Amino acid sequence: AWNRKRISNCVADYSVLYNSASFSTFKCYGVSPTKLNDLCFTNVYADSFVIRGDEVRQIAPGQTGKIADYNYKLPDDFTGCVIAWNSNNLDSKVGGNYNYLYRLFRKSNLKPFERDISTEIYQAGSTPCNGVEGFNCYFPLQSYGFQPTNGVGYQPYRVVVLSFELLHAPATVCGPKKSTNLVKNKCVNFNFNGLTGTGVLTESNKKFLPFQQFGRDIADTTDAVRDPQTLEILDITPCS
Amino acid sequence: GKIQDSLSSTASALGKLQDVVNQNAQALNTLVKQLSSNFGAISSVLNDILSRLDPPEAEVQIDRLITGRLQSLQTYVTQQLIRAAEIRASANLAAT
């Protein structure tokens, strides 16, 4: 039952994450880690869970593992970055820790970006358990073995998955940049909320309804944009 | 007099000619739209891909786009030549 948080309507700096470099693994798909700030995105999601170091490879696009195919499966088109880093000290207790669990058995493969909240013991074929849980019938939960004495190789890793989708709606998940005053009637490079295009900017006659944030022509190319701070509507054309 | 009336009353006279006009317009439009298609790439817009990808990765995706985009262009040029040749024959006939 992985924890998911939706982060939006705010400004995040990824330099500290990239900059800090206190994490064992910082794999990035479809996004340059260094280039993260410049790009702007909407509907960012956060994934929380802890799995052993050996299975860290399994939590990636187009990979196979018991947990990946039975607990949490990343989509093929994922454009997110996943960060891993050990917290051995936190996972070592004198009493021992076993509140962390992973599923062993399930009848069918878990869907991508979905969590199975159902609590049941997996049943295989005949001699149905109905809570009997003897031989060939297995309870859904399975605990972990994180111990201080236990080796680093199988020691706990803390894994966070960062997933984002871009160019759908106006984006508030924008990065670090200090904005600049708008320039009109002069061919200049421009970026609006993580959207980049270059053309002449002029006051636009076209009237936009409150919900809309973009305009397009017959060829589905950007034709108009609204400066978020200003509230105005303008027409973009190639300079020359 | 009749011919004047016939011409004003219908688009059928220019259908043989117009088909050529429409067919050329449609071919150009498809190719232009092609730009939108991903062609196996992460994202269709060229700048977007470059902005969010580091050079080596960006290299691969760029290559993919070019191959997809090269093919699109090839079809247009190849398509255009056949039509050009067809139009050329008419002009000779046209010129004749």
Binding site: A219, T221, P238 | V32, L35
Partner: peptide, 30 residues
């Protein structure tokens, strides 16, 4: 200039083409 595709102007204008056509027609009758 629409999106990197440019439609060059015709070498002969529509008006110029009409004169050639008019000339041939004029020549035929006279």
């Amino acid at each position: 200039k629409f999106n990197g595709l440019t439609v060059l102007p015709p070498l002969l204008t529509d008006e110029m083409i009409a004169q050639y056509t008019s000339a041939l027609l004029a020549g035929t009758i006279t």
